[PDB]
């Protein structure tokens, strides 16, 4: 572990013993998914599985184009389809779903196993499986419901932002494959620029609420979207509006720990000083004099 010496966050690691991160002068990268240019071809699902050496089961059709129906340990990205008339005419909104590579990841914050989840200087959040204990805390800590457990090895898996390709200078497999160029990749700074240019074009076409989805509640994401209707992200098969780490999780992983620590220390002190101060309670402390 830590061979790259650019680990800026590490799960279950005390704040006063930070992970190796001297090689942190690197530009943050990002994937930009422009749903207004997506044709729902699923090429990204196929390219992802092919590159990553994984295959999900052959499922069933239950009335919709969506398939697989959900992310799983063997499907790291899935296209989600939504038909709606909420905006005045029939629209088919199609969105690629998978890890958002949050700047402040809830999965990492909730994880109880040291080093099971890490965040690289470039923004990629990845699972170091040797340390995963299969507790599933990360599934609840994630504001986007992304981590998935593999029944065959009790470990979670998800989109790695093709860390094995990016680490040596190549863009992710899904990015490269996208037929229409709905998916873009590069430094986050220039992806934000491309996103704003696209939003301007959508507004010029009549989408007054077009916008970039890069949620401040999780510190921004390294997988962002350009949405025709940024005022209604739920329309895109439940994309959360203003996502953030849940308050109960923040308290549980935050203040509860040192509070409990103080109680324990204080209790031990009290009991110890108590025994010593007063002495045992035996049958006769009186005939001892």
């Amino acid at each position: 572990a830590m061979e790259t010496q650019d680990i800026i966050k590490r799960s279950a690691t005390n704040s006063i013993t930070p992970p190796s991160q001297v090689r942190d002068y690197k530009a943050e990268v990002a994937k930009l998914i422009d749903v207004s240019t997506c044709i729902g071809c699923k090429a990204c699902q196929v390219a992802c599985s092919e590159w990553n050496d994984i295959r999900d089961e052959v499922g069933h059709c239950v009335g919709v184009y969506d398939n697989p129906a959900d992310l799983s340990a063997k499907s790291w990205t899935v296209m989600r389809f939504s038909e709606t008339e909420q905006n005045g005419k029939l629209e088919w909104l199609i969105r690629k779903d998978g890890c958002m590579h949050c700047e402040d990841p809830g999965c990492l914050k909730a994880c109880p196993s040291a080093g099971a989840i890490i965040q690289y200087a470039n923004g990629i959040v990845d699972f170091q499986s040797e340390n995963c204990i299969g507790c599933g805390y990360c599934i609840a800590g994630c504001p986007f419901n992304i981590p998935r457990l593999n029944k065959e090895d009790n470990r979670v898996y998800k989109c790695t932002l093709c860390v094995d390709r990016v680490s040596v200078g190549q863009e992710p497999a899904c990015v490269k494959t996208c037929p229409t160029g709905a998916i873009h990749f590069g430094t986050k700074k220039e992806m934000l620029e491309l996103a704003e240019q696209r939003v301007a074009k959508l507004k010029a076409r009549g989408y007054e609420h077009a916008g970039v989805y890069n949620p401040e509640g999780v510190g921004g994401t390294h997988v962002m979207y350009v949405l025709h209707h940024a005022d209604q992200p739920e329309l895109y098969h439940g994309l959360p509006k203003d996502p953030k780490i849940d308050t109960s999780v923040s308290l549980w992983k935050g203040a509860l720990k040192p509070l409990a620590a103080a109680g324990f220390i204080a209790t031990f002190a009290g009991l110890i000083f108590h025994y010593i101060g007063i002495g045992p309670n035996k049958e006769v402390d009186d005939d001892e004099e």
């Binding site: 507790c135 609840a140 509860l256």
Partner: protein
């Protein structure tokens, strides 16, 4: 009053108790290892961290089952009554080893009764929240929000119960003669007179009386 000891705890309740204690050691330590990851050594409570994740909940269930057997056998002796107030008011005096002077103590005192209900309530809370956060078997059926609350509550309940047990062990170590009674089952009449007056008075009467009832 002509015997060194009097039976305070039956074998069945002694066997159970020490079974709970052993299971609790493993469950509490594994739980603490997830709570305070810096204490790495505790990740080997069940051998490996991966194994501990699996076994913690199973041993937890066992503790609950055993505590329910304890509940139905001890609850009637742990019922709060007006006679418990005296205790609750001279706590500072009881901690200095002067309880007899200040209270009416039956089978189990007012502190033991509070501990009993605390322990019994927490294991119920831990059972419910534990099942809810249990992967791969049960967490899937619950709304994510419920799972999140359960993660917070379970951690909190687990910590509260561990504090409680620390205090419960201390007291047991403090009011000397107590551990032997839980291991062997017998308490000396003087221990009964000092720490549990009313209680021994009752055995003494039940005793003598029914033997006087026989018709010597």
């Amino acid at each position: 009053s002509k015997s060194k000891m009097i039976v305070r705890t039956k074998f069945i309740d002694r066997a159970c108790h020490w079974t709970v204690v052993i299971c609790f050691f493993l469950v509490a330590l594994s739980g603490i290892s997830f709570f305070f990851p810096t204490l790495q050594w505790l990740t080997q409570t069940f051998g490996t961290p991966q194994m501990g994740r699996i076994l913690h909940p199973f041993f937890g269930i066992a503790i609950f089952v055993a505590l329910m057997f304890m509940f139905v056998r001890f609850v009637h002796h742990n019922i709060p009554d007006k006679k418990d107030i005296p205790w609750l008011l001279n706590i500072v005096e009881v901690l200095k080893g002067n309880e007899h002077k200040v209270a009416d103590v039956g089978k189990y005192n007012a502190g033991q009764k509070m501990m009993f209900w605390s322990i019994m309530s927490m294991i119920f809370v831990l059972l419910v929240t534990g099942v809810i956060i249990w992967r791969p078997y049960f967490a899937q059926y619950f709304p994510m929000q419920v799972v999140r609350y359960s993660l917070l509550i379970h951690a909190a309940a687990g910590i509260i119960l561990i504090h409680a047990i620390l205090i419960h062990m201390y007291m047991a170590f403090w009011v000397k003669g107590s551990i032997k009674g839980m291991i062997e089952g017998k308490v000396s009449r003087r221990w009964a007179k000092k720490h549990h007056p009313r209680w021994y008075r009752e055995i003494e009467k039940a005793e003598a009386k029914k033997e006087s009832e026989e018709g010597i």
